[PDB]
Write a protein that binds this ligand. Structure first.
Ligand SMILES: Nc1nc2c(ncn2[C@@H]2O[C@H](COP(=O)(O)OP(=O)(O)O)[C@@H](O)[C@H]2O)c(=O)[nH]1
Ligand SMILES: [Mg+2]
Length: 164
């Protein structure tokens, strides 16, 4: 069981960091993270199935309005990411959802609030984040890529939803 997954959202929310954390077990201090290939990979056991997850990176092209059709094509699951400290990233989420739906239709999707380790400087109230999850009817995670909190859980959930 091989699965292509996309991770989308505004720039600097921590998308590349999330993929690096899940597939390599690392977190670096750089202001911007880079992946040198189309996707990183992790092989896991899910309900007696050997599953191979392939997580595709946007290559920073969201800041230049230039994400290609090839990025989205074939996707079987999706992570929508916004940042705790970035008001604009939260407001953009429903539009990112439409971009994916337009390309591949309905696929298992999770909503993610990253950088929860910086909660004292939060630009989004809990009720606001929950209100969005309810409206889009999506599983919602409070995540810290930095502290490795609720990263692995997201991809496991999505893998299980693909199989059932
Ligand atoms: N404090 C904190 N910083 C993070 C977290 N995740 C990513 N970052 C940082 O946010 C910046 C942007 O990360 P990046 O992966 O390049 O975001 P992307 O543009 O969405 O791919 C980098 O400096 C990361 O180290 C987190 O959970 N907490
Ligand atoms: Mg990136």
């Amino acid at each position: 069981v091989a699965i292509k997954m996309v991770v989308v959202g505004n720039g600097a929310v921590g998308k590349s960091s999330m993929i690096q954390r899940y597939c390599k077990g690392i977190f670096t201090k750089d202001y911007k993270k880079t992946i040198g290939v189309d996707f990183l990979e992790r092989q896991i056991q899910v309900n007696d199935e050997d599953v191979r997850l392939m997580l595709w990176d946007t290559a920073g092209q969201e800041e230049f309005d230039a994400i290609t059709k090839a990025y989205y094509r074939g996707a079987q699951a999706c992570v929508l990411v916004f940042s705790t400290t970035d008001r604009e990233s939260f407001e953009a989420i429903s539009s990112w959802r439409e971009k994916v739906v337009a390309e591949v239709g309905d696929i298992p999707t999770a909503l993610v609030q990253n950088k929860i380790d910086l909660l004292d400087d939060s630009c989004i109230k809990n009720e606001e984040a929950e209100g969005l999850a309810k409206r889009l009817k999506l599983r919602f995670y409070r995540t810290s890529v930095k502290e490795d909190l609720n990263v692995s859980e997201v991809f496991k959930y999505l893998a299980e939803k693909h199989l059932q």
